[PDB]
Every structure is written in structure tokens, then in C-alpha cells.
Amino acid sequence: GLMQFTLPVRLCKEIELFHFDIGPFENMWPGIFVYMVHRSCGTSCFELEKLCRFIMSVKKNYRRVPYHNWKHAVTVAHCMYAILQNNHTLFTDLERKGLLIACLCHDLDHRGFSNSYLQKFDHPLAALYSTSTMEQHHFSQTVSILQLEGHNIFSTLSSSEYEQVLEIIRKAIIATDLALYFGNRKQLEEMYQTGSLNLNNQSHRDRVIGLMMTACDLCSVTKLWPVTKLTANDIYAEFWAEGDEMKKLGIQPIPMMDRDKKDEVPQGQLGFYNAVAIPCYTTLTQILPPTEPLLKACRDNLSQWEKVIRGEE
Ligand SMILES: CC1(C)C(=O)NC(=O)c2c1ccc1nc(Cc3ccccc3)[nH]c21
Ligand SMILES: [Mg+2]
Ligand SMILES: [Zn+2]
């Protein structure tokens, strides 16, 4: 109980900032997550032995894919940590518990393929879950690991609190389906502008937690340019492999997934920042003003992609 995790000074300071990169030392990532839980939630939230066993089972159930991997899980949890720490009083005790775990678990057992590809391949998971296919699978995998012996980090919650926290985690994980992002943000936009947004309305909180989940999920666009640029390569490594698998099924993939159309990537990043990223952090900044640095960093990275197109790099 008297056993804090402490980070070296540069990490202790920079981990508080939105643009923090967790670094290339895999063995430090479990400690960074526990550090973040202890400060975000409390040193009493989780039994340390159980938490540690949970983290290591989650790590084991992330695959060695270029982007949708263990490092993404921890990266997305760090962004949630930064949002929670900058919005201290807005979130319940159960919410701070649930959301850091939801983020860590949100892409469990990802294979590096979209819901679209699962459906066109006729993958078994596409027959078990007709929409938000991989996201229903990620929640399913989270519950599985929580039910491993000595892995129930929520064991001290009442029967009804346990149900609420698993309901927080399910919605948060489903919300990382980008197909659901567009309508969720439009609805949040209308509620904020017409003045009807109400954080005591559970259905409203749900929508706001969903946008936070999209914001954390896309947070590679809020890093320093060299982090953002190299992470973009990793996601395109997945996209191009999926395009290869589409061609093997006799389907010309969309240009984004076609490795013969790499030239079109800079313009695809513009569309993505304009259609997805900027609107996401804009609405988030309206609802939670302290998250403005994510919008500022995203805008700086858009400008960097515009410079790539203009041959200024
Ligand atoms: C943040 C990061 C890694 C990025 O830097 N650059 C991307 O392009 C990207 C990212 C994450 C998830 C992405 N999903 C898509 C596909 C998509 C395109 C248009 C509309 C919806 C969905 N692109 C993604
Ligand atoms: Mg996902
Ligand atoms: Zn993700």
C-alpha cells in the first residue's frame, strides 16, 4: 500500500503532458500504466498483485501487428490519463477506474484488419457480431481476462458497481468503432450549440465518454511531428496488408489500402484530419476546455502534412 511507482524525472514531468510518447522500452510500459492508475484513480483502486497480473495477461493478448499492438493500448490509456488529470472533478470514482482499463483493453486481440475485411472474408466473428465486429470481440476478450483466476481487479466493488463499471467499459470500447464516431460527434455538436448538453444526463455522459475514447484512440495525431509521421507508417503497414488480402479475395481495395497508391497518402492524411481528427478535438475542446492542447497539436500536424504536399518536406 505504501509502494508508489516513481518514474525518472524527464518521464515524471512529460507524462503529465498530452503529447508524451511512452518510448521504445516495452518493459517500462506496465509501470507507466500503474503510475497513471495510482495518480488518476488512487493507490487503493486496485490490488497491486491482481492489477500486475491483469496488465500482463492483457499484454499477452495483444498481437505483434504494426499499429494495433500493446504500445497503442498504453498510448491510448496515457491520453485518457491526461484528459482525466486535466478534468479532475468532472468524472466519478467508477469512471476513472473503468476508462483507463477500457483504453488498455480497447483493441485486445486485434489482427490488423478492419471490420469491413472480416465481413468480406466471411470471418466467424462477423457472424457472431454483425456491427462493431472487432469492438464487440475486444470487450469479450476483456471480460474473459477479468474472469481468469486472480485477475478480477474489480473484486471489492458491489454487485451493482461491478455491473456499472463493466457497462462503462463496454460502451467506451464500442465507441472506438469509428463508424459510430460521426453520428456521436454530430449529436454532441447539436447538444453543445443548442445548450441542451447536460453532464447529469447519463445518456449525455455516455456520448461524452465516447468522444473521449475516439480522442484517445486517434491521439497519435496530437504528438510531435516525428512521432505522428512514423506512427502513420505503422497504420499504413496494416492498411496495405489489408489491401493485399482484398486483392487475394478478388476485390480492388480503396486507394487508402492500395500499396501501389502510396503517393496519395499525404492527401489521405488531409481528408482524415479534416473529416475525423480536427472535428473530434474541436467538439472535445468545447465540452472539456482543458483538452485544448490536443486540438492545437492536431492542427500543427495538419500543417506538417500540408508542407509534405507542397514539397517543403
Ligand atoms: C491516428 C492515425 C494513426 C493517423 O495518424 N492517420 C490515420 O489515417 C489514421 C489513424 C488512426 C485510425 C485511422 N483510421 C483510418 C481510416 C479512415 C479514413 C477516413 C475516415 C475514417 C477512417 N485512418 C486512421
Ligand atoms: Mg479498435
Ligand atoms: Zn485503437
Dihedral sign from CA coordinates of 36, 41, 46, 47 = positive
Domain that holds residue 117: 28-310
Catalytic residue set: 68
Question: CA-CA distance, 147 to 169, in Å (whole number)?
Answer: 15
Domain-located, residue 20: no
21 assigned to some structural domain: no
Instruction: Supply 67's cell numbers.
Output: 499499429
* Residue 7 lies inside a defined structural domain of this protein: no
Pocket of ligand 1 (CB under 6 A): 178, 218, 220-221, 231-232, 235, 269, 272, 275-276
Assigned C-alpha cell, 71: 504500445
C-beta of residue 81 within 8 angstroms of C-beta of residue 40: yes
Would the annotation count 106 as a binding residue? yes
User: What whole-number distance in Å separates Cα of residue 74 and Cα of residue 66?
Assistant: 15
Q: How far apart are CA 121 and CA 206, in angstroms?
A: 32
Max distance between CA atoms of the chain, in angstroms, equals 60
Residue 13 lies in a domain: no
Domain contains 238:
yes
Handedness of CA 51, 56, 62, 68 (dihedral sign): positive
Ligand 1 atom closest to the Cα of residue 181 is 21
**260 among annotated binding-site residues:** no
User: What total of structural domains would you count in the chain?
Assistant: 1
Domain contains 296: yes
- Is 163 a member of any domain? yes
The atom of ligand 1 lying closest to the CA of 275 is 20
Q: Crossing angle of helices 159-174/202-217, nearest 10°?
A: 50
Closest CA to 273 of 234, 228, 313, 312: 228
Q: What is the CATH number of the domain that holds 65?
A: 1.10.1300.10
Reduce the secondary structure of the chain to three states and give it as a string: CCCCCCCCHHHHHHCCCCCCCCCCCHHHHHHHHHHHHHHHCCCCCCCHHHHHHHHHHHHHCCCCCCCCCHHHHHHHHHHHHHHHHCCHHHCCHHHHHHHHHHHHHCCCCCCCCCHHHHHHHCCHHHHHCCCCHHHHHHHHHHHHHHCCCCCCCCCCCCHHHHHHHHHHHHHHHHCCCHHHHHHHHHHHHHHHHCCCCCCCCHHHHHHHHHHHHHHHHCHHHHCCHHHHHHHHHHHHHHHHHHHHHHHHCCCCCCHHHCHHHHHHHHHHHHHHHHHHHHHHHHHHHHHCHHHHHHHHHHHHHHHHHHHHHCCCC
On whether 269 is known to bind a ligand per the annotation, the reply is yes
Q: Judging by beta carbons within 10 Å of its beta carbon (0-12, 13-18, 19+), is residue 233 exposed, middle or buried? A: exposed
In this structure, are residues 273 and 204 in contact, taking their beta carbons and an 8 Å threshold?
A: no
To which residue does cell 492542427 refer? Answer: 299
The Å distance, Cα 217 to ligand 2 centre, comes to 8
- In angstroms, the Cα distances linking 16 to 35, 103, 275 are 11, 17, 28
Write the residue with the smallest CA distance to atom 1 of ligand 1.
218
Length of the chain: 313
Question: Cα(first)–Cα(last) distance of the chain, in Å?
Answer: 51
For ligand 1, pick from 234, 273, 276 the residue to mutate: most ligand atoms within 8 Å of CB.
276
Query: How big is the chain by its Cα radius of gyration, in Å?
Result: 19
Identify whether 11 is part of a domain: no
- Which sign does the torsion angle of CA 147, 160, 168, 31 carry? negative
